[PDB]
Amino acid sequence: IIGGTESKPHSRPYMAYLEIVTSNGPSKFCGGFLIRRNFVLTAAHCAGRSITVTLGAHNITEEEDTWQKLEVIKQFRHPKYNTSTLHHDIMLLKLKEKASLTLAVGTLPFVPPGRMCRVAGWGRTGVLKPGSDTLQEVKLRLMDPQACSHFRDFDHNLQLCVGNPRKTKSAFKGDSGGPLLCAGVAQGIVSYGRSDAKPPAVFTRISHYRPWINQILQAN
């Protein structure tokens, strides 16, 4: 997160920290969020050979009793996820066990331009800075779809256009998959933007994918 501030520890108990294993490189990281005691929502571009999820974290380098580290048994990447157009950037992760409900760990159960929303993550705090140790958050403006025109594949039915171009606030590398909360409901998921972090950025519009989400959760 660029231009944000450190979150009050454990104030976003649905936040998931994802470590992504691939077979040919070192580990990568994404955010995500707990929608059911055994399901994490995140971005399809976070998929890999295997993933481990840490719940209950604030400072990701300092183990504490709030931590729940859980194995992912299956990844359900959206079947239409397209690496050319970048549409349908969404994935469910099924956890091996049900997470415990604690002060630090809970679910986040289930919109037009103008509204201020919040995003949170452990990602880079600058173009050339490392990922944050601690969970950071920022407030971002929802924009009219026109503000995202220069993303040629942007589609207002599937995606939200997020961040006032006059400000430097943005999600960045490592924040992928994290929720956009507007009035305490998750409305989007960090998807993509410019390499230089100049806003706005493109978030997956969660309402369009609700039938798909329900179908996976009911069959599992």
In the complex, the residues that contact ligand NAG under the rule CB under 6 A are 59, 61-62, 82-85, 133-134
Joined together, the tokens standing for residue 189 give 């998921």
Query: Of 33, 28, 34, nearest to 46 (Cα)?
Result: 28
Does the annotation count 11 as an active-site position? no
Q: What is the contact mask toward Zn ion in residues 61 to 80, using x (rule: CB under 5 A)?
A: ---x-x--------------
Query: At closest approach, how far in Å is the CB of 68 from Zn ion?
Result: 12
Query: At closest approach, how far in Å is the CB of 178 from ligand 8W6?
Result: 9
Query: At closest approach, how far in Å is the CB of 96 from ligand NAG?
Result: 27
The torsion region of residue 116 among left (phi > 0), alpha (psi -120 to 50) and beta comes to beta
Cβ closer to ligand NAG: 82 or 100? 82
Chain positions 138 to 177 lying near Zn ion, rule: CB under 5 A, are none
Cβ closer to ligand NAG: 150 or 152? 152
Query: Of 210, 30, 47, nearest to 120 (Cα)?
Result: 30
7, 132, 176, 191: the active-site residue? 176
Q: Does 138 bind ligand 8W6 (CB under 6 A)?
A: no
Q: Does 159 bind ligand 8W6 (CB under 6 A)?
A: no
89, 132, 170, 175: the active-site residue? 89
Q: Does 90 bind ligand 8W6 (CB under 6 A)?
A: no
Backbone breaks in the chain after residues (C–N over 2.5 Å): 110
The DSSP line for 135-200 is: -EEEEEEB--GGGGTTSTT--TTTEEEES-TTS--B--TT-TT-EEEETTEEEEEEEE--TT--S-
Does the annotation count 65 as an active-site position? no
Chain center to CA of 131: 15
Question: Which positions are catalytic?
Answer: 45, 89, 176
